Amino acid sequence: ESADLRALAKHLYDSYIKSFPLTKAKARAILTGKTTDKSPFVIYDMNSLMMGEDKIQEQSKEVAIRIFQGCQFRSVEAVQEITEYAKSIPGFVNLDLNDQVTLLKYGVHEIIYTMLASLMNKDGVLISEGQGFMTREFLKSLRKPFGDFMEPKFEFAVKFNALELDDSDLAIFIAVIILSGDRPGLLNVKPIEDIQDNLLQALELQLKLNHPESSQLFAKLLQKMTDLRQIVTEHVQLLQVIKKTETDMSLHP
Amino acid sequence: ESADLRALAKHLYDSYIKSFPLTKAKARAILTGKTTDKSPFVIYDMNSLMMGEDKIKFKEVAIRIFQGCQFRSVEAVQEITEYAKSIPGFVNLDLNDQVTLLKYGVHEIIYTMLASLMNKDGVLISEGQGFMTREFLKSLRKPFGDFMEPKFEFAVKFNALELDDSDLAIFIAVIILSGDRPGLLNVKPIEDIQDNLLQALELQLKLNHPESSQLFAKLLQKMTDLRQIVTEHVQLLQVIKKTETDMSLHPLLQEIYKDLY
Amino acid sequence: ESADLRALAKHLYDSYIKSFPLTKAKARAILTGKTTDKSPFVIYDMNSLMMGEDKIQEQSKEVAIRIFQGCQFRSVEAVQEITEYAKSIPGFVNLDLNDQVTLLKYGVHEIIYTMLASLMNKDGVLISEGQGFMTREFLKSLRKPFGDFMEPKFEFAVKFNALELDDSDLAIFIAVIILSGDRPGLLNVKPIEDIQDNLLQALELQLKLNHPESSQLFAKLLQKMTDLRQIVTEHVQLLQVIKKTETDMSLHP
Amino acid sequence: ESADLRALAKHLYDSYIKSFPLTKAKARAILTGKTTDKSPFVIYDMNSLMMGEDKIKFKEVAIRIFQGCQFRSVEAVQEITEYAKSIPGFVNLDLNDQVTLLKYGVHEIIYTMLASLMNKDGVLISEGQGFMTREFLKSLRKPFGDFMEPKFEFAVKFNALELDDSDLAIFIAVIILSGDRPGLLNVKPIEDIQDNLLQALELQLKLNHPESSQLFAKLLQKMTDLRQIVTEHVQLLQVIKKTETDMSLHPLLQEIYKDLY
Ligand SMILES: CCCc1c(OCCCn2ccc3c(OC(C)(C)C(=O)O)cccc32)ccc2cc(C(=O)c3ccccc3)ccc12
Numbered sequence A, C: 001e002s003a004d005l006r007a008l009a010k011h012l013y014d015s016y017i018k019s020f021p022l023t024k025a026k027a028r029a030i031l032t033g034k035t036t037d038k039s040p041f042v043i044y045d046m047n048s049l050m051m052g053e054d055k056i057q058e059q060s061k062e063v064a065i066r067i068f069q070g071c072q073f074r075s076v077e078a079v080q081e082i083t084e085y086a087k088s089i090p091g092f093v094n095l096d097l098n099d100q101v102t103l104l105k106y107g108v109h110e111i112i113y114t115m116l117a118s119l120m121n122k123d124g125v126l127i128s129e130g131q132g133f134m135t136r137e138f139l140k141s142l143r144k145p146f147g148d149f150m151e152p153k154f155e156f157a158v159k160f161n162a163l164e165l166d167d168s169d170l171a172i173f174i175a176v177i178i179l180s181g182d183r184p185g186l187l188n189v190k191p192i193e194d195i196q197d198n199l200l201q202a203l204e205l206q207l208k209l210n211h212p213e214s215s216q217l218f219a220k221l222l223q224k225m226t227d228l229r230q231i232v233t234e235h236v237q238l239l240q241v242i243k244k245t246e247t248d249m250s251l252h253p
Numbered sequence B, D: 001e002s003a004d005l006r007a008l009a010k011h012l013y014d015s016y017i018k019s020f021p022l023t024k025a026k027a028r029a030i031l032t033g034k035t036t037d038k039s040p041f042v043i044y045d046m047n048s049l050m051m052g053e054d055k056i057k058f059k060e061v062a063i064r065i066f067q068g069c070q071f072r073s074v075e076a077v078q079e080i081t082e083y084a085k086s087i088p089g090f091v092n093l094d095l096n097d098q099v100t101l102l103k104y105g106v107h108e109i110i111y112t113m114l115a116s117l118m119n120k121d122g123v124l125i126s127e128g129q130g131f132m133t134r135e136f137l138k139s140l141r142k143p144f145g146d147f148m149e150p151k152f153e154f155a156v157k158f159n160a161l162e163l164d165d166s167d168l169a170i171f172i173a174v175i176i177l178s179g180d181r182p183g184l185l186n187v188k189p190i191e192d193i194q195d196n197l198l199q200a201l202e203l204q205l206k207l208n209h210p211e212s213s214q215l216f217a218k219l220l221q222k223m224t225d226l227r228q229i230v231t232e233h234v235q236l237l238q239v240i241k242k243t244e245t246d247m248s249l250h251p252l253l254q255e256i257y258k259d260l261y
């Protein structure tokens, strides 16, 4: 029944609302300018960044490295909200505990980049819960290894954003990502694929009802799942350059 | 010998009385209107269910009814365990065999005795204080609606055999003492008791239902219907891990369901 | 009429024979040594106990706790034989069903300790239907809470056994115990006391005819009924220490 | 609200399961004999210690045992850090506060969870593969023998409270979120979380131990025993600089012990 698939969609969208306080709808309002009153502080160079550093870690290092560190910090926060949203996907908590941990270990990065896109435009990204805005041009200008980190996330966002997904579409897409039966080291693949097949069904009906005029959006959306694997693999390999060739250490356990 | 067998039948009936407060006679007296004390509140839909719970003045719906089934089934296990201990020869058996026989017997016996509380229109709940309609139960959201109907289909046909409590006392003793439960260490001492219970069940039906042709065989055939209801239910349980969020049953039922057929 | 009271005694003694296969007469034969041929295996330490464990639950725990558990098991068996003997006491099955259950709930412990005495001497107790013999010294040696459990049963047995009751005396004494009109929660006290008054009469004549030389044995026997209440109360309070302060669980419902 | 608090309790229990492989239930199952896999080799003296190390076929003694304590305590820090991160609100705190709370919380939590592995006769070591006796540990050359006994005296009494893993999951979360650690920049956001954890701990004990009088207060009183064990241990550490030759602890523990109370 469609009605069951709609109620699952609805239930996913409500859990997503709780887990993630800065939604696409809210961020697009800030990127554009709905109800303009609390316009975020813009960080467009080294000067404005420090202006905005002691406007709100604290100064004691090279700026590229503190920005990079700040992203480590923020992405450990985001793993906690993602972990919470996962618990609400039907069937997920009744899976083997170790496979639960394995799905999250490998899912979380792909989910963080999908969600960052809601915070990005072609020119910069919302930071500190929509309070700052950092320009892509400034991120691009940082010294060489650090200059190339965010740029591939911006390229993906721009292409993903022209799909015009909303939060209720993304609530299901996020769940399909978590429940991927091909991650290394999963004990029971079959129960995970049975869950994902039900979420695939609900995703498909969601897009058909919400975007009747985008032909084959379901399929273009699945195909974005290869682009995401590649951003993750690129980003993981860029962490290797850091680990080897750098002097600063302060990382989240 | 006859006298042995009649005294076996009387013993089990007396202990069945002591172990199960809501017997068939009492459920039928309530269902029939015959009672002279109090008439059961009927739950036929979502508004009357709200009123039925909130008759508490003197989660969601499906989950909260599936949760009320658990508490009741926990209590029935205890009542059934108490009756087992009184079956001659049962407590003298290997302790692991006593455990295995209950682990497997108990749900067969739950469905058997749940027929006593059913007609084709619904089921008596809360010590016979409510009545939930078959149509309401069947209306429930996908999986949870699937749990209830096969129990009704069984009861309607078991119920046309017209067994009474004293017949039932021995039938249930026969179920418990089944020598084909997996993992039994000492099959023969169990089979020997089942044999003597079978002989008693036989005499009891001949004496109690002299006009009822092949009642004994028709009753043992029901034993196969029971086993299929239990295998169906256990398949339903797996559906509940996949479709639902945090499920994890009550401690005593997790044990009963752990590594079961 | 005495003749009615004698026929009741006789009828009680015959039911008792059926219900309880290891009688005082048989156990005293084994404690002493009539027809010596099948001399029970003696359990006098941890070594001989295990020698006798895999000579016949099975090994997987602390020995004090398995002995204690074994006694739970055996005493649930004995409740079934006692329940059966009760049905044969005239008037008992025609009492209120709930009062029948209440008399047995509270009577059964006092009866188990009266009957154990037939299996005891000053030095140990017959176990496994007269096949084993466990020494009092070994029970006494078990770790501290478990060491003190059986010792008060041995003290009572030694004092009760010097009364020299036989099975036909005990068949009536057991029946007088079951039919006690003072247990908590009895609905109809009066019909129970009318039955017990008839059993008291038969007991009195039994002892007068069987033990004419023991002055006032009837009265010394009634007085043993307070000693028995106290063993039961002591034993019930010793179960409280267990429930609170222990780690192992495996108990009969 | 109750539902909030029960779901807080379940969350912490689930993440406690994921972060600590040797839980109380498993250590007690091993200590109890209840396990069905493998029985621990006991070290009671110097000959059996040699055999216990050299059970490696499938420095001096005191120093080599004090060195094995370090490796284990390093791993427990990592496990405890992993559990901290999962405590709602913890990763959103000032980064220096997160560091300070761990710096101080971790040894309190080490002694707490070390009680799970103790009885009055000894301690389970190497993932429950060995057992070192209390008498052996106490026999050790002056200072090194002094390290062990106060831990046993604590465990015996903590252990008579009969907490289980799910109780423990919240107790340990309460310890971490202590707003009185020296050098904290932002006390109130921590205290607010401890408050909500306290409310949850309270409900959990009432529900899990309904017959256990003032369990909650008796458990918070243990928090003072813990702090005195940590101050005692740190005094023991200074003794080890004076009495011993080259000592210098492992990198991560030097950090934890650097400028501590
Ligand atoms: C022995 C259960 C009898 C029963 C009932 O009939 C059950 C028919 C099918 N059935 C038998 C067992 C069983 C069942 O058993 C479980 C607990 C899952 C099991 O043993 O594994 C689960 C679902 C259905 C089911 C329906 C509703 C009840 C509802 C209630 C309630 O207390 C209640 C709860 C909420 C609102 C109103 C009333 C009690 C018992 C019910």
Ligand SMILES: CCCc1c(OCCCn2ccc3c(OC(C)(C)C(=O)O)cccc32)ccc2cc(C(=O)c3ccccc3)ccc12
Binding pocket: D052, D053, D064, D065, D066, D067, D068, D069, D070, D071, D072, D073, D114, D123, D125, D126, D132, D147, D148, D151, D253
């Ligand atoms: C978490 C430690 C548990 C533990 C153990 O119990 C420790 C009880 C008291 N205690 C807690 C922490 C601690 C302790 O911690 C240090 C590392 C100094 C610290 O954190 O600062 C130092 C001494 C004693 C001590 C005894 C022996 C062990 C021995 C071993 C071994 O691997 C081992 C080493 C050598 C020979 C046989 C076995 C591991 C753990 C042991």
